[PDB]
Design a protein around this nucleic acid. Structure first.
Lengths: 141, 84, 154, 70, 139, 48, 41, 142, 147, 44, 809
RNA sequence: UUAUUAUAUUUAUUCAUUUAAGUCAACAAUAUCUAUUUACUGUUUUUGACAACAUGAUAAGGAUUAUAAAUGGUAUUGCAAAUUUUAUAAUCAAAACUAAUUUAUUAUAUUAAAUUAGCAUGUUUAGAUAAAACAAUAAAUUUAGAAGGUAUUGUUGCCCACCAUUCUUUGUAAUAAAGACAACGUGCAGUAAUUAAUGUAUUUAUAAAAAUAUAUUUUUUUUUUUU
């Protein structure tokens, strides 16, 4: 046995540093909450980059033809309403059922944090530099 | 409890030795005994003793072989006092 | 190619050595057979490699031939030059399999994985949807979305 | 399939078990077919056994844990 | 392992991407196996359940006993509750009754006794003439 | 071998020692115990 | 108390082993850990 | 333990970096009590349904002389935030109170309210050895 | 002493052992009357047909529990137990969708923007004002609650 | 951990000491011997 | 002393010797020095004598093998009959060869009877039966055009016979050994091989696993497994050789008591038959029970003479003899020379094996804190075990004198071996329709609303339903008039009430058991008690006079009248302005109310299309002349879909109840929930919300426990199929709004019977729909109602160690 | 390197968790001949198993005894049977890391019910380093059999000089000699001992000592009877 050796006292008057610290931290807890909550919500209201991966069929087909037709006409206003998040569109797109089962099997989709980039995310440096002040679990923007 | 523990000796016969254990049944078969006998028949010098094997190998069903036919019949002619 | 995430490379011998585990995986060499077969390309190196493994797999159980003392060492030398040949036979085939496939994707328009070169369509390394700012080796900040090398229509 | 039933038997370690099972079968049907089979080993049985589970090895089969020196 | 091209992509539910700090980041249930293992057992069961339910060419329709097909005009023991019941041994008809499907055109009698112009549900079955001469008979 | 005593009803080293049966022996019944039927006691309960 | 002849007694107290033999193959191999471990045979 | 941080150091042994089964780790160390994932702010470390009834510790069973502190599973309500009286939760070193009330605290159990691993560490509580290890860490540099 | 251990317990010791212990009166299993469907299972609370196992089994007892909890409890006292959503009605952001399904459904209208303050340069929340003083809600306890 | 070097191959037991001696090497194709002795007896 | 046993009785051997030859002079002592250096070529690879393995018992604490025979060894000869090839019980096949030839012979006799009543044994060969089920591929592919050619060229053209491989003389020497005696067996596609159907193969293998228990052994047969009672005794000892030698003992015990006890009854049976041996001389009581039946076998109402009764009896003893003497015979077969207990045909009783119980208990052999690998690497597996043997005794009759020989076996069992008995005795049960009446449906069919949680607690008076057996003769009813309202026969009524020779209005007649129009003993429509005169003109003003006027309990009056109970005595605050009902008109407790043949039975019976006037009365049980009259005779049944039920005739009817009688009435539940139904009227609880207001906007975060995934969306209005959709949105002009679906119900959700009227969801056919729908993954720990006790997969608690194949009889 | 038999051999690496005390004794209620026993009361002198010292005792760890059924050890690892003489420290719900002795899930689909883990994106990239020969598949760059110890459970063994107090003692030579003795510092001189040692001679010097010259073995051995 390393015979269990005592830790000394908690120190004189540290309790006051405790009741203080925990409290005013819990106050900071509000603003980081208030900030991140807004960031989450206002993220949900914005537009995203299109979740599909254009490289793979059936999204290699030119914008004029292919599933872009139904994307442009049968559901166009809808896909803007859903704000192009990768959760609803893949559910909306599956409902129209005019492309069959090629949503999951054939059509390959962007990775997660590549699909939370908002519209007009030109520079690829962006998807990694999302702010650190907000605690969202990478739903924020 | 007496009748069980009797080990009736394997050498009930000539050159073909009886099995008494499951590992010994692996190295034994009525077909292969013909090999042992054809090895003894061709080792017998004269026709008369070559009987006691064939006479025996007919007792327990040791199936004869082609060379069993040769060993007997080849020396069947060469035994002088034979009757045709 | 459905696999696109970043990768890890291993030298030819370090893959050739696995033999029937992955290198001579029966169905794998059947894959690159048909692919060779259908392209009108003769499958000469594959069937050249196929007999190499098939004999090694068949004889992987036995002992090595008894090492009797030979001051000449010709047997030990022949034991080496015949080996390094076999490695050099699979070396060519290992590279050959990677040669056609990346070029094959040039004909099916399948974007290979990261840090991958197709002779004409992606002269330097293609990298799209990686885990980093820049092209891992060329230090070029990636474009978003993943850049495309083929023409859009089918 | 008398043994532990699995969905797909696509592995040689099972094929040999079948290659042997058919080998022993022919012999029982035909007596003198045991000669060309036994000389080629299809009758003989492997005693190879994949190592049973054991907690000590990290994966559980043959690779022990780690230990670093101070 | 969780290479996103595994398990039909549904492995994306179990993946902590990037250089995670094993202590603070990374969900717990993604670590223990049996939970990962029990989960895959869910999804893997779905494909079976999906495929079993994509082959539902038949549609289940109840029917009073009197005018049911003469195949099921006997006691029908429920599934998983008796040795599989071959339909008719004497009639040389050995097919599981749960596997025998009856054609909608065959049964517009009771099921669509409300048919009026009885064809209006469906036209009758055109059964192939298996006897007269045809290419099969070299003619 | 300590303060905690050995449970003589569940220990093999005891039950399968020489001072009791071994698990190999014919394991029959040792001796019939006719207690309640040779000298029986009458029923004097404490609960009335 | 039944009995059948002994072959070797083995007093394995914590101090030591003292293994006597009067060789045979075996039968039941008795055991006692009352205070001193002994392996009758 | 090597350093008996309480009475339960003398008894239980570390047993190395033992891997307990999931959710059966013996000590209930809720060091992840306050990890703010704003989207799941109502589902993380809360009742999995939002129609459960409040836990027992938010209520008073019988005629109590008085609790020194109310337990940390208690959930904070508006009555909590508006009455403003001293509400105490057990923590090291002695106790923590919610002196500055807010409505951002209403609805979340006290587990998610307090910060268990206080960032300000005690150079006083740790011997020269255990402090030294913090110096190498950079958590308590020099 | 001489090894004659009985392969079988002798017939004598069979009778001597089998007569030292009494027959259970219940294992006799005689019944010509039948079963008492109305009364048998409802016998006195001492020797009653005691249900056991899964909670389904306690039919005649759960009814007593309800009749019991109905008895002692005044509804007055039970009113004070609040559901979670009853409490979360007082939170600045009481109900907002989570990312699994209806993330897009959330809107700025759900934001309690007046609670905090925004700074245009940072675009973030610099701080928050006090909500305990100025929260005037007609239902501190919910409406149907009447102490 | 070992912490000592790896031992040689010879000191390790035989790698396939369990597979029966009949299988290493597998004398495959016993069918043909009767075909080959005939054609050989033909030419001779 | 408690220790005076533990001394040693003799003088131990003494130490006067040196170290034995070459022993201690590292060297591990356990290995015999010289004996092991003895070359294996000379002694072999054997370690323990080459005897049948079952002799050896895996020793404990002494890592070797020991013979359960005390140093004696039975050679392999005793393990087989005389001169057995490879020492087998039978020469013909090995273990597997005798395993699968069993079935192939057992299928040759399989007939649909062989399965019924028998459990897993009743199932045929899994393969021979499943391939038969596959008549898709069964179409017998005739030998190909090539084969019939290559043979025809051979057999005729090249003058060469063709021989099948079995018949090929592979022999080099013995080309006179014949082909196997079946060289001409017919090869078909159905029988061999066994290529079977996949989903059916599931249905077989599953139904096999569940029907293991459904063995009905108490039969009336004459076979090796025919019996009236089948006791199974499961001995349990820690050592296999213990339980075997014991399972051998009880056999030669029950073979004794079993032989004698059954023999006395056989001595009785032959006595109960012979020419001047009567005993089955029929009881006047028994000859009544055969003739106690309104309608027998051949013409009308029946009568048996005492003779054929005395024939029916002997018609059965002949079987209780054949089953008896067939037992004594199988009792005397096993001799010490040829004892084989494990075969039912030869021995009685016949011991049945059972898989031993094994519980691996692995643990860290080390104990230290700093290093965990030290612990894990130090794992050692020691197992607990218990070996079972099951004795199966089948008595053709249930003798209690024998059973109490059985339950005394627990005393003299071999040391450390407990036993359990599985008795299985036929029991005669009366299904008296008087208590459980097979009556029509309730007019108001109960629904899923009657089967929520706690429905057993509050929705159903535990069966059997209570029925009134007591009925008061009304003012001027006659015997036919009472038999009318009770729907019973006047003659049956005359027999039922022996004491009632004349009907005096106001006395209660005892309802006959065979009645068909008895009432549910309560009234359903609520009744109120006005403060109208009652007792004198003074009204009710206190709790006791409240009870006195209704003549029921103050308590049960409070139970229903909750609001009046929470305020005052008889709710002293009377009615002003508008009469306060619960105060003024106290609701009589449901218990104080009596039923009425009006409210009980629905007097409205529906009519269907195939109905005729008499056909409806044939269903209702009444006469057409009673029906048509009571219904104001119609020209045809087409107009009225619900003809009123006949005012009950004198004899009987089968009318539907107004409401299911078993259903626990709500008034009683009001009584059970008295206080809470009070505090509604007390504090005026208008309504309490379950979910906040905006819930319907917020679909997910409000997922109540009773709610379940995958969530069912709102149904598309009528898009049940494509025509329904096309006609609705694409082509409005199309005539067929929906193609003609089945008039009878179409449960697409097969086989999951789902509640009707509920918007329901078909399982998703395309994968894309499966992944994208919101389905949770099992993040938290796993829980199951049954095996939550057995906490983990690792720690499997066993309250009782029983063989994992222990089938409760 | 002496005349049935193989190491050269991949697959890995960021890992942590413990709380807020309470042992000084036993008592049938139904259906067997009746006990209120119903509610069987008698007032108080010790200090081991502990928060502390307190003998025993089973593990982890591979290195040279299978060809016709076996790859994990004793020297010892927290709670154990004779050493007591400050002291309650034990799991209970809701609970806070500093810890050597640990598979964590890496991009088609991802939180359903006892409460369970939001920052670490950066070329499956430093140095260190981990574990297989067993129902699988790698069978050779190669092996008994000769050898030493100042230690004396033995290389993590001892020893050695210079470098301080001392003390003692003188035949007083930088900076007396000798002997004693245990510090610190400097190596690592010696035990075939990291270029073998010893000796003698010359020279050299932090210090054991080193270079050159000769003998030498208290160093270990390598061996043509005229080609």
């Amino acid at each position: 046995w390393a015979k269990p050796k005592k830790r000394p006292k908690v120190g004189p008057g540290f309790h006051e540093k405790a009741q203080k610290w925990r409290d005013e931290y819990l106050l900071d807890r509000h603003r980081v909450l208030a900030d991140s909550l807004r960031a989450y919500v206002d993220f949900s209201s914005t537009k995203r980059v299109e979740p599909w991966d254009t490289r793979f069929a059936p999204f290699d087909r030119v914008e004029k033809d292919g599933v872009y037709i139904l994307t442009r006409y049968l559901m166009d206003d809808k896909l803007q309403l859903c704000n192009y998040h990768h959760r609803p569109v893949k559910r909306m797109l599956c409902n129209v059922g005019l492309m069959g089962p090629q949503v999951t099997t054939t059509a390959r989709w962007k990775p997660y944090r590549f699909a939370t980039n908002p519209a007009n995310t030109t520079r690829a440096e962006r998807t990694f530099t999302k702010d650190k002040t907000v605690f969202t679990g990478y739903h924020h923007d | 409890s007496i009748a069980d523990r009797r080990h009736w000796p394997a050498k009930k016969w000539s050159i073909g030795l009886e099995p008494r254990t499951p590992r010994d049944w692996l190295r034994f078969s009525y077909r292969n005994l013909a090999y042992a006998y054809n090895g003894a028949l061709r080792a017998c010098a004269t026709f008369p003793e070559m009987l006691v094997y064939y006479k025996e190998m007919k007792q327990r069903g040791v199936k004869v072989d082609v060379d069993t036919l040769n060993a007997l019949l080849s020396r069947a002619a060469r035994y002088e006092h034979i009757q045709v | 190619n459905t696999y696109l995430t970043r990768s890890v490379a291993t030298p030819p011998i370090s893959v050739i050595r696995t033999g029937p585990k992955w290198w001579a995986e029966p169905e794998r060499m059947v894959k690159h057979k048909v692919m060779y077969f259908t392209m009108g390309i003769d499958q000469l190196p594959l069937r050249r490699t196929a007999v190499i493994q098939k004999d090694l797999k068949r004889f992987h159980m036995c002992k090595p031939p008894p090492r009797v003392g030979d001051a000449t060492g010709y047997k030990r030398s022949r034991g080496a030059q015949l080996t390094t040949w076999y490695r050099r036979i699979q070396y060519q085939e290992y590279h050959l399999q990677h040669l056609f496939v990346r070029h094959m994707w040039g004909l099916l328009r399948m974007y290979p994985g990261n840090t991958t070169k197709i002779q004409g369509k992606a002269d330097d390394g293609y990298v799209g949807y990686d885990s980093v700012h820049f092209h891992r080796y060329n230090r070029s900040p990636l474009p978003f979305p993943a850049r495309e090398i083929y023409e859009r229509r089918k | 399939s008398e043994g532990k039933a699995m969905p797909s038997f696509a592995n040689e370690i099972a094929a040999f078990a079948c290659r042997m099972a058919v080998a022993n079968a022919i012999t029982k049907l035909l007596p003198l077919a045991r000669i060309p089979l036994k000389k080629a080993g299809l009758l003989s049985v492997d005693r190879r056994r994949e190592p049973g589970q054991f907690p000590g090895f990290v994966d559980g089969k043959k690779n022990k844990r780690k230990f670093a020196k101070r | 392992m969780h290479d996103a091209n595994r398990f039909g992509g549904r492995t994306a539910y179990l993946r902590e991407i990037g250089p995670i700090d094993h202590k603070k980041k990374g969900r717990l249930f993604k670590r223990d196996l049996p939970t990962l293992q029990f989960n895959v057992d869910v999804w893997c069961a779905q494909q079976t359940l999906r495929k079993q339910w994509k082959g539902r060419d038949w549609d289940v329709v109840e029917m009073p006993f009197e005018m049911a097909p003469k195949e099921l005009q006997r006691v029908v023991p429920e599934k998983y509750t008796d040795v599989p019941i071959m339909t008719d041994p004497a009639r040389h008809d050995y097919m599981n009754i749960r596997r025998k499907v009856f054609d909608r055109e065959d049964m517009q009698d009771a099921l669509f006794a409300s048919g009026g112009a009885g064809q209006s549900p469906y036209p009758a079955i055109q059964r192939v003439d298996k006897a007269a001469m045809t290419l099969d008979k070299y003619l | 071998l300590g303060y905690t005593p050995i449970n003589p009803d569940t220990s093999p080293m005891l039950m399968y020692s020489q001072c009791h049966w071994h698990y190999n022996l014919p394991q029959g019944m040792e001796r019939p115990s006719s207690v309640n039927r040779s000298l029986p006691a009458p029923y004097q309960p404490h609960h009335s | 108390s039944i009995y059948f002849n002994l072959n070797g007694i083995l007093i394995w107290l914590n101090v030591l082993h003292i293994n006597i033999i009067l060789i045979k193959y075996a039968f039941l191999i008795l055991l006692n850990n009352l205070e001193y471990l002994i392996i009758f045979k | 333990l090597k350093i008996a941080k309480s009475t339960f150091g003398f008894y239980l042994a570390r047993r190395g970096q033992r891997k307990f089964p999931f959710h059966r780790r013996p000590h209930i160390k809720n060091t992840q009590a306050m990890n703010l994932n704003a989207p799941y702010f109502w589902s993380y470390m809360t009742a999995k349904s939002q129609s459960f009834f409040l836990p027992e510790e938010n209520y008073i069973t019988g005629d109590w002389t008085g609790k020194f502190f109310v337990s940390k599973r208690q959930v904070y309500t508006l009555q909590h935030a508006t009455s403003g009286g001293k509400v105490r939760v057990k923590s090291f070193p002695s106790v923590f109170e919610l002196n500055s009330p807010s409505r951002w605290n209403v609805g979340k159990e006290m587990n998610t309210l307090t910060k268990p691993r206080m960032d300000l560490i005690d150079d006083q509580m740790l011997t020269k050895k255990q402090r030294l290890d913090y110096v190498k860490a950079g958590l308590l540099p020099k | 002493r001489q090894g004659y251990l009985p392969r079988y317990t002798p017939w004598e010791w069979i009778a001597i052992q089998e007569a030292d212990q009494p027959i259970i009166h219940e294992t006799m299993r005689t019944d010509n009357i039948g079963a008492s469907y109305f009364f048998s299972l409802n016998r006195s609370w001492r020797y009653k047909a005691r249900p056991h196992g899964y909670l389904r089994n306690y039919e005649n007892e759960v009814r007593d529990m309800l009749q019991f909890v109905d008895g002692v409890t005044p509804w007055k006292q039970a009113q004070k137990i609040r559901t979670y959503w009853e409490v979360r009605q007082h939170h600045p952001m009481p109900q907002f969708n989570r990312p699994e399904v209806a993330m897009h459904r959330n809107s700025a209208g759900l934001l309690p923007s007046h609670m905090w303050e925004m700074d245009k340069k940072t675009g973030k929340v610099r701080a928050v004002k006090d909500s305990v003083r100025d929260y005037q809600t007609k239902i501190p306890v919910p409406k149907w609650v009447q102490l | 951990r070992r912490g000592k070097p790896r031992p040689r191959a010879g000191m390790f037991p035989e790698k396939y000491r369990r597979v029966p001696t009949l299988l290493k090497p597998q004398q495959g194709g016993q069918q043909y011997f009767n075909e080959f002795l005939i054609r050989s007896a033909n030419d001779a | 002393y408690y220790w005076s046993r533990y001394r040693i009785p003799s003088q131990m051997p003494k130490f006067d010797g040196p170290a034995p030859v070459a022993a201690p002079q590292k060297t591990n002592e356990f290995i015999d020095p010289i004996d092991d250096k003895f070359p294996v070529t000379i002694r072999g690879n054997l370690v323990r004598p080459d005897v049948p393995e079952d002799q050896y018992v895996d020793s404990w604490y002494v890592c070797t093998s020991m013979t359960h025979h005390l140093g004696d060894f039975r050679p392999w000869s005793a393990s087989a009959p005389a001169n057995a090839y490879r020492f087998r019980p039978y020469n013909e096949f090995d273990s597997k060869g005798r395993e699968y030839v069993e079935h192939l012979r057992k299928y040759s006799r399989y007939t649909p009877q062989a399965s019924r009543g028998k459990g897993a044994n009743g199932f045929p060969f899994r393969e021979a039966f499943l391939t038969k089920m596959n008549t898709a591929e069964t179409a017998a592919v005739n030998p190909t055009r090539e084969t019939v050619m290559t043979r025809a060229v051979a057999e005729r053209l090249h003058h060469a016979r063709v021989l099948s491989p079995l018949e090929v003389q592979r022999d080099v020497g013995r080309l006179e050994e014949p082909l196997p005696c079946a060289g001409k067996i017919p090869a078909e596609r159905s029988t061999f091989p066994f290529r079977w159907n996949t989903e059916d193969w599931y249905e077989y293998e599953v139904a096999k696993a569940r029907n293991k228990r459904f063995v009905f052994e108490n039969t009336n047969d004459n076979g090796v497994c025919a019996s009236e009672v089948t006791y199974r005794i499961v001995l349990e000892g820690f050592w296999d050789h213990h339980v075997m030698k014991l399972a051998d003992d009880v056999v030669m015990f029950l073979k004794d008591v079993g032989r004698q006890v059954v023999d006395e009854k056989l001595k009785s049976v032959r006595a109960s038959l012979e020419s001047l041996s009567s005993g089955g001389a029929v009881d006047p009581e028994l000859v009544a029970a055969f003739n106690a039946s309104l309608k027998g076998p051949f013409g009308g109402a029946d009568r048996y003479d005492a003779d054929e009764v005395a024939h029916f009896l002997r018609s059965e003893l002949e079987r209780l003899e054949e089953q008896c003497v067939g037992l004594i015979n199988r009792a005397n077969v096993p001799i010490p020379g040829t004892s084989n207990i494990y075969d039912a045909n030869v021995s009685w009783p016949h011991v049945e094996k059972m898989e031993p119980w094994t519980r691996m208990a692995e643990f860290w052999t080390s104990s230290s804190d700093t290093s965990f690998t030290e612990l894990e690497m130090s794992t050692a597996h020691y197992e607990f075990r218990k070996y079972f043997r099951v004795v199966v005794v089948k008595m053709p009759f249930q003798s209690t004198e024998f059973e109490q020989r059985m339950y005394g076996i627990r005393h003299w069992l071999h040391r450390q071996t407990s036993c359990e008995f599985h008795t299985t005795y036929r029991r005669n049960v009366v299904h008296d329709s008087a208590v459980f009446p097979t009556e029509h449906d309730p007019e108001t069919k109960p629904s899923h609303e009657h089967h929520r949680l706690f429905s057993f607690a509050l929705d159903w008076q535990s069966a059997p339903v209570d029925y009134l057996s007591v009925e008061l003769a009304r003012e001027g009813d006659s015997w036919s008039s009472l038999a009318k309202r009770l729907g019973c026969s006047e003659s049956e009524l005359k027999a039922a009430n022996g004491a009632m020779e004349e009907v005096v209005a106001g006395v209660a007649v005892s309802v006959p058991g065979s009645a068909t129009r008895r009432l549910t003993s309560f009234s359903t429509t609520p009744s109120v008690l006005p403060l109208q005169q009652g007792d004198g003109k003074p009204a009710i003003t206190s709790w006791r006079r409240a009870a006195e006027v209704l003549g029921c309990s103050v308590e049960e009056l409070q139970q229903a009248n909750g609001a009046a109970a929470l305020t005052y005595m008889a709710a002293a605050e009377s009615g002003d302005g508008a009469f306060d009902p619960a105060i003024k008109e106290l609701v009589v407790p449901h218990t104080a109310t009596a039923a009425s043949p009006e409210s009980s039975f629905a007097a409205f019976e529906p009519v269907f299309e195939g109905d005729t006037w008499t056909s409806i009365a044939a269903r209702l049980g009444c006469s057409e002349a009673d029906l048509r009259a009571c219904n104001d005779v119609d020209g045809s049944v087409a107009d009225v879909s619900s003809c009123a039920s006949v005012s009950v005739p004198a004899s009987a009817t089968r009318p539907r109840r107004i409401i299911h009688p078993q259903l626990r009435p709500q008034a009683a539940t009001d009584a059970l929930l008295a206080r809470t139904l009070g505090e509604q009227a007390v504090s005026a609880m208008g309504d309490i919300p379950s979910l906040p207001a905006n819930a319907h906007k917020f679909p997910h975060e409000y997922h109540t426990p009773t709610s379940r995934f995958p969530t069912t969306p709102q149904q598309s209005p009528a898009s049940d199929n494509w025509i329904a959709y096309t006609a609705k949105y694409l082509d409005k002009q199309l005539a067929l709004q929906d193609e003609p679906a089945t008039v009878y119900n179409v449960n697409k959700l097969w086989p999951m019977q789902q509640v009707p009227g509920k918007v329901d969801q078909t399982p998703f056919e395309e994968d894309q729909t499966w992944l994208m729908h919101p389905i949770p993954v099992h993040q938290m720990q796993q829980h199951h109602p049954e095996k939550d006790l057995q906490d983990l997969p690792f720690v499997n608690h066993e309250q009782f160690p029983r063989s994992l194949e222990w089938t409760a009889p």
